[PDB]
Amino acid sequence: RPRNISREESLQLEGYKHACHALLHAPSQAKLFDRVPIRRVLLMMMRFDGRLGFPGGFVDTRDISLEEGLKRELEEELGPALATVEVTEDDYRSSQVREHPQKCVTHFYIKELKLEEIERIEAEAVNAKDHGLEVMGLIRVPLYTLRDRVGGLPAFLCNNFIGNSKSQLLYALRSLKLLREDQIQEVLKASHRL
Amino acid sequence: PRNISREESLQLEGYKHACHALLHAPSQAKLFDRVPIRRVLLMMMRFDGRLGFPGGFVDTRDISLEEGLKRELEEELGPALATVEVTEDDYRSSQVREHPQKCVTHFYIKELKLEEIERIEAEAVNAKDHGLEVMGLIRVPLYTLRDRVGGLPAFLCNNFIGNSKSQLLYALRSLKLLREDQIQEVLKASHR
Ligand SMILES: [Mn+2]
Ligand SMILES: [Mn+2]
Ligand SMILES: [Mn+2]
Ligand SMILES: [Mn+2]
């Protein structure tokens, strides 16, 4: 149902509800089992509704800017550590629009941090206003495929994702150059053997 | 997957052993000041992309099923755990499979104080296994939302390792959190 739309065009519409979500990420030299390289830490979360999503939430664009709304949502959900860390217009990536079930536009941001910054974010998430309520926990996204050819990313893609968050994740994998187009197809295939 | 006994368990030959625990605490918190959380139940995202309970393998002949579990927990949840009891009284059940080379997993349910769960979550990011075997802790939503889908039923549509779903369901019956009919209602809501 979701369709692409430019930021600028989408900011012009009327009586549309807006949401902002961010992928925070950082490179890692860690190797799982000292063999399988982690490569990069991507944060997602388990939401109060039983589903996985990226942090963020609604913004009222007549009151505050998209970035200001995003900063506030992250503070609630991810905690104090998000202060001084500034997701800006540069971090903006894409906008999608729908009408079923509600007139609704979601914006997706992608921001690289230093590893210790992600770690400090994890360490302090348990202190967020939303911890154990709207946010049920923070999780890192496995980017590897294991030898059984299912465990890791393919298996993880069989989890339950809110809205278009799965599709956003896949976008980021292709944009941060982490997987080739075919690799993504391979991942969706290995996943879909239910 | 077939239910078995502790009695037998330790005596079978050629099987690999695994221990897992549900740590849980009561809670007075209300989501949107409306929906009661009731209880906090810990699970995790594994390195394999699946949800499960903390723990792992333990050499049967080396030390007791508790000694293996308590080590596994400390390794996966962090230092805080060295002061968790995890006695025999916390033992719960043992299922036996013949899939990925004959497994036997034992399930443990143990009640803690909310503070204790909170301090565990707070130190989990320090566990030897953080960012490796354990990719993050999560609380299990026990409520069902107004849409009659979000909350627990949606949660059960996630990808679960081994029989950690069976185990979770058992806990909800065992801990008197849900009746059999109510469990049967979330499953139908979920698998729809
Ligand atoms: Mn959110
Ligand atoms: Mn929010
Ligand atoms: Mn909030
Ligand atoms: Mn271990």
Side-chain angles (χ1 to χ4, degrees), chain A residues 2-8 10-70 72-83 85 88-99 101 103-148 150-194, chain B residues 1 6 8 14 17-57 64-66 68-70 72-83 87 89-93 96 98 100 103 105-112 114 116-118 120-127 129-147 150-172 174-175 177-184 186-187 189-190:
Chain A
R3 98 189 76 105
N4 302 27
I5 180 162
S6 84
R7 178 180 179 150
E8 202 196 56
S10 80
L11 275 175
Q12 287 165 7
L13 305 182
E14 228 76 34
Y16 270 89
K17 200 157 202 218
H18 292 260
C20 290
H21 301 275
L23 169 65
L24 305 182
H25 66 112
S28 171
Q29 310 300 284
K31 291 167 165 155
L32 172 67
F33 307 133
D34 306 314
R35 178 183 88 259
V36 179
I38 288 305
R39 303 177 77 201
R40 196 172 279 276
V41 178
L42 287 76
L43 295 185
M44 298 196 70
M45 60 185 229
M46 174 70 68
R47 296 154 42 86
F48 65 93
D49 62 9
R51 309 195 182 89
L52 300 176
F54 290 103
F58 298 124
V59 181
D60 179 346
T61 53
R62 297 165 295 141
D63 176 53
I64 63 188
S65 89
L66 294 181
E67 286 68 25
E68 181 48 38
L70 180 62
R72 300 189 183 175
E73 277 305 321
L74 298 184
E75 197 167 305
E76 275 196 301
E77 278 175 39
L78 295 187
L82 263 296
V85 162
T88 59
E89 316 201 58
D90 307 318
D91 305 312
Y92 169 85
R93 222 43 95 216
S94 68
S95 291
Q96 292 174 278
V97 60
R98 62 161 47 212
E99 287 78 355
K103 291 166 146 58
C104 182
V105 174
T106 64
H107 314 275
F108 185 57
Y109 289 72
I110 289 172
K111 191 181 214 318
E112 181 167 50
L113 297 177
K114 308 190 177 78
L115 188 45
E116 65 102 312
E117 256 165 314
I118 293 282
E119 292 162 2
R120 182 207 274 110
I121 288 169
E122 283 169 329
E124 280 182 72
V126 300
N127 292 318
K129 169 189 170 164
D130 286 354
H131 177 67
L133 296 155
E134 262 209 12
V135 175
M136 291 300 186
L138 279 189
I139 70 134
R140 311 185 165 187
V141 172
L143 297 178
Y144 40 93
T145 304
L146 296 183
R147 270 174 304 159
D148 70 14
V150 181
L153 189 46
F156 170 79
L157 287 175
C158 288
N159 290 302
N160 198 347
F161 295 78
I162 189 67
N164 64 352
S165 70
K166 190 181 217 170
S167 146
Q168 297 177 327
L169 172 55
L170 294 177
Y171 167 87
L173 300 173
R174 248 287 81 194
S175 134
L176 301 166
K177 286 278 194 166
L178 292 164
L179 300 205
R180 316 178 222 102
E181 195 42 63
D182 67 342
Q183 272 165 325
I184 274 148
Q185 295 310 291
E186 172 54 43
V187 158
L188 273 340
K189 211 209 184 180
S191 198
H192 276 45
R193 62 233 256 181
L194 265 78
Chain B
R6 178 163 203 203
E8 294 152 83
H17 295 269
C19 300
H20 301 280
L22 162 62
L23 305 190
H24 70 103
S27 165
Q28 316 304 290
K30 288 175 189 161
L31 182 69
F32 321 123
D33 319 305
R34 190 181 73 231
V35 175
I37 301 293
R38 317 179 58 205
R39 209 162 267 281
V40 175
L41 279 61
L42 290 190
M43 295 200 82
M44 69 190 202
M45 177 65 70
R46 302 147 49 71
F47 68 96
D48 62 356
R50 297 170 172 98
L51 295 191
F53 290 107
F57 296 92
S64 65
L65 284 174
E66 345 288 295
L69 178 72
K70 180 163 172 277
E72 286 305 288
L73 291 186
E74 193 163 321
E75 210 197 291
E76 270 171 37
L77 292 187
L81 268 284
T83 39
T87 61
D89 318 305
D90 300 301
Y91 176 66
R92 220 50 99 193
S93 62
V96 57
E98 333 266 354
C103 188
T105 98
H106 316 271
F107 189 44
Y108 280 71
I109 300 169
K110 169 161 227 319
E111 191 185 32
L112 295 174
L114 182 48
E116 290 182 289
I117 288 306
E118 281 158 7
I120 288 154
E121 285 178 337
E123 286 179 359
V125 304
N126 296 325
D129 283 312
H130 180 62
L132 296 182
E133 294 211 329
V134 187
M135 296 288 264
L137 300 192
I138 73 200
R139 299 175 171 200
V140 172
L142 307 172
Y143 46 82
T144 307
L145 280 185
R146 263 177 318 202
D147 78 354
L152 184 60
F155 182 74
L156 290 168
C157 293
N158 285 303
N159 194 6
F160 291 82
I161 187 74
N163 62 354
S164 67
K165 191 163 175 174
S166 210
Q167 291 176 331
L168 170 57
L169 293 177
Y170 168 102
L172 309 181
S174 155
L175 287 175
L177 284 173
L178 302 185
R179 303 180 312 265
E180 183 52 22
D181 56 306
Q182 291 176 294
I183 287 159
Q184 218 51 231
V186 314
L187 289 170
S190 182

